[PDB]
């Protein structure tokens, strides 16, 4: 279950953070790697979508702790583009 | 008619606002939830598209009252990505 | 030929400008209306794509006159999203 | 192999840079031209995707040298939109 383990790893990493550029960088990276996972054919679409949603939830929570509103909208936009990218 | 009722609720909320980050946050949230509505299979595409257009119209009107041009373009971009997201 | 006439009208409007927020606003509006043209079924995809390209060329030229680099990238991104929006 | 030669030309250009707005401008331009390559029917999708990935890797490396984080996220977003644009 590569998608859920990647989401797991990235959620773990991100929860530790008290910097917002750092957490944003990591969230977008995790989303990139979630999309890369599907493109190579190594997990089904539904699994990647689940991972994206869980990672994004955690990342947006952290960002809201640090008050990083701009970054929150930026990650949501990227999440929506990533979401489109996965469904072919 | 879940889409129109969600658009209705969000239009109602947003019209009350005199803050631009608040109205922007709410518009994008409503658009997220409009897209989420379809993904679960709980309303047809045409209905969600209508809701997105009506919500976006109201939100952009409010934002123009408060002079929030940056946010206006940001919501339009998100509206277009959401629109793509709905049509599979 | 609704697409080319809309592009024509908007190119005409935009060439007159010496403000960059104004020209950007108008370019994005023209692109919105170009996409709206297709959605209603009132011109073929190829025609709208042509109009988008010509309008975007003119708008980016004007913006470069005024040195509005941020807006240029923003219009290009919106142009690419609009382009995706048209091809279903 | 038009895609790889375009990526090659642009990678060559970009490696020379010590300005971040310049390298960003060039990366996005190369990605535009990579997408334009496919639309005219002059290279297969897989080739353009390879070129986009290699160009983006180099550009993001340069940008990280110059500390241009905002531009990095902007190029990644554009890379994802370009990627969607290529797969029809
Ligand atoms: Zn990305
Ligand atoms: Zn969203
Ligand atoms: Zn638009
Ligand atoms: Zn572009």
């Amino acid at each position: 279950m590569k998608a859920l383990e990647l989401a797991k790893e990235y959620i773990e990493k991100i929860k530790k953070l008290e910097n917002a550029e750092e957490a944003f960088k990591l969230a977008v990276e995790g989303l990139d790697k979630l999309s890369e996972l599907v493109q190579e054919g190594e997990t089904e679409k539904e699994e990647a979508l689940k991972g994206v949603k869980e990672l994004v939830k955690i990342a947006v929570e952290v960002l809201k702790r640090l008050g990083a509103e701009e970054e929150i909208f930026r990650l949501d936009l990227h999440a929506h583009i990533i979401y489109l990218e996965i469904r072919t």
Side-chain angles (χ1 to χ4, degrees), chain A residues 30-63 65-79:
Chain A
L31 293 206
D32 281 7
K33 264 145 151 78
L34 284 164
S35 189
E36 275 185 35
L37 258 193
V38 164
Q39 293 324 307
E40 302 258 304
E42 317 206 3
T43 181
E44 299 300 303
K45 289 175 183 188
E46 89 272 330
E47 218 198 307
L49 305 165
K50 227 195 261 183
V52 164
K53 239 198 100 173
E54 296 296 310
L55 174 47
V56 154
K57 189 234 202 231
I58 295 302
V60 160
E61 286 188 346
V62 173
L63 290 168
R65 195 170 33 95
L66 313 181
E69 311 302 321
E70 184 174 56
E71 293 66 23
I72 285 168
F73 170 73
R74 280 180 148 160
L75 178 56
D76 163 278
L77 202 62
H78 199 254

Side-chain angles (χ1 to χ4, degrees), chain A residues 6-8 11-12 15 17 29 37 40 43 62:
Chain A
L6 190 90
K8 190 236 210 283
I11 282 154
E12 282 176 330
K15 277 177 159 158
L17 302 186
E29 159 167 307
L37 258 193
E40 302 258 304
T43 181
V62 173

